[PDB]
């Protein structure tokens, strides 16, 4: 079906990229392939493990023994006790819910924010050498063997090098 254009440029996921969360894919004169950015993947796993633990471990816990007995003649108290309980129920239920809700919100943005940072890092290297074409795919104006490629992903991309060649293909038919 149709979809707002405000929806993340990279439309689909990759059952293909099994090794990690974020990562790349290449089509060059040597074959296809996927690749997981381990260092970023570990990073995010470290952070999320922390949010999970925070949400869990930050919660205090006194030894409590809820529960009280009264008789047919201490009903006012019993109702005071009732509301202290219902009172706490309505509180925790509400915070337990909005907490997971809002934290689930932020966590799926983290991830979004995270790939968009990867795609940024790349479009910043491959200045003119490449065409940005959508769903976060760059096409090359120049051959790009498994050096060039393990290189763009190494953060170590040579721009002058392949620039000369690419200069001419931003011309031809």
């Amino acid at each position: 079906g149709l979809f707002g254009a405000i929806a993340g440029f990279i439309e689909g996921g990759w059952t293909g990229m099994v090794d990690g969360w974020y990562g790349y894919h290449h089509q060059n004169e040597q074959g296809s392939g996927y690749a997981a950015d381990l260092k970023s993947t570990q990073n995010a796993i470290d952070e999320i493990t922390n949010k999970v633990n925070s949400v869990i471990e930050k919660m205090n816990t006194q030894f409590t023994a809820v529960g009280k007995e009264f008789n047919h003649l201490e009903k006012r108290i019993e109702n005071l006790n009732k509301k202290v309980d219902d009172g706490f129920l309505d509180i925790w239920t509400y915070n337990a819910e909005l907490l997971v809700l809002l934290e689930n919100e932020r966590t799926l943005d983290y991830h979004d924010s995270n790939v968009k940072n990867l795609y940024e890092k790349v479009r910043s290297q491959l200045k003119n050498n490449a065409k940005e074409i959508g769903n976060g795919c760059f096409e090359f104006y120049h051959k790009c063997d498994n050096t060039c490629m393990e290189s763009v992903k190494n953060g170590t991309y040579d721009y002058p090098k392949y620039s000369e060649e690419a200069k001419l293909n931003r011309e031809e038919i």
Partner: nanobody
Amino acid sequence: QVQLVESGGGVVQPGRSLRLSCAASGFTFSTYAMHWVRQAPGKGLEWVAVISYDANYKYYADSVKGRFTISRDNSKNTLYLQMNSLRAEDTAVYYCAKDSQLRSLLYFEWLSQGYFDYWGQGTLVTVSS
């Protein structure tokens, strides 16, 4: 405080099977990854397997992939190694160990483990015809 006891070691004919247990005491078992480590008689230390706290992630040393099945029971606070079709190369003393990291998410085969904070007194397993 912390206590880890291994059992079920012994001598088995090659090709056959063995199940090690390890009872834990002194900490919240159900929130830590757990490892099995071994040491060939006189040789170095070989990491062998890790099972995540919830138990939906099990990872093995290349050299036991296929034949060993790591498992746990938080209800009983114990950790198991079930070795199958044992070679003599498997003869070793087997140390039960604790990951330092609380609730580590082992979503991936390669991610990092904590360190090994507490160890078992270790039980030896001899494979031999």
